[PDB]
Amino acid sequence: GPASVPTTCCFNLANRKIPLQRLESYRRITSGKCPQKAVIFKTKLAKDICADPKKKWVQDSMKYLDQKSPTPKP
Known about the structure:
Blueprint: E1 23-29, E2 38-43, E3 48-51, H1 56-68
Antiparallel strand pairs: 1-2, 2-3
């Protein structure tokens, strides 16, 4: 589901568009200790999924959370 074996960064991007009502949060990665860069979405089922920033639902999803979100800090 979320991981497979190498714990570093997402690899298997999500194909099934995730809904907003079920979305809880999201996490993006782009550090230097990773082979690739992408985003990760979290639904309201205590589960995380991989997502690339070149999708239509991921972009809207990220923009949605980024828009709905108030401001970062922690």
